Amino acid sequence: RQIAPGQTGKIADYNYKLPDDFTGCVIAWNSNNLDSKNYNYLYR
Amino acid sequence: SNCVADYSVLYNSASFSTFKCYGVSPTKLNDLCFTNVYADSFVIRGDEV
* Residues on chain A touching B27 (C-beta within 8 angstroms): 8
- Dist. CA A31–CA A12, nearest whole Å: 23
Cα A12 to Cα A2, B6, B28, B33, B44, distances in angstroms:
7, 21, 15, 25, 28
Which residues touch B11 (CB under 8 Å, ≥6 apart)? B19, B26, B27, B29
Give the number of residues written for chain B. 49
- Dist. CA A5–CA A20, nearest whole Å: 5
From A28's Cα to the closest Cα of chain B, the distance in A is 21
Taking the CA atoms of residue B44, residue A8, residue B10 and residue B49 in that order, the dihedral angle to the nearest 10 degrees is: 0
User: Residue A14's closest chain B neighbor by CA?
Assistant: B12
B11 touches chain A (CB under 8 A): no
Task: Give which of A20, A9, A18, A19 is closest to A44, Cα–Cα.
Answer: A9
Resolution attained, angstroms: 3.3
Cα B23 to Cα A8, A43, B29, distances in angstroms:
15, 29, 11
Cβ atoms of residues B11 and B42 within 8 Å: no
Which residues touch B1 (CB under 8 Å, ≥6 apart)? B35, B36, B37
* Residues on chain B touching A10 (C-beta within 8 angstroms): 14
Task: Name the method of structure determination.
Answer: cryo-EM
From B24's Cα to the closest Cα of chain A, the distance in A is 13
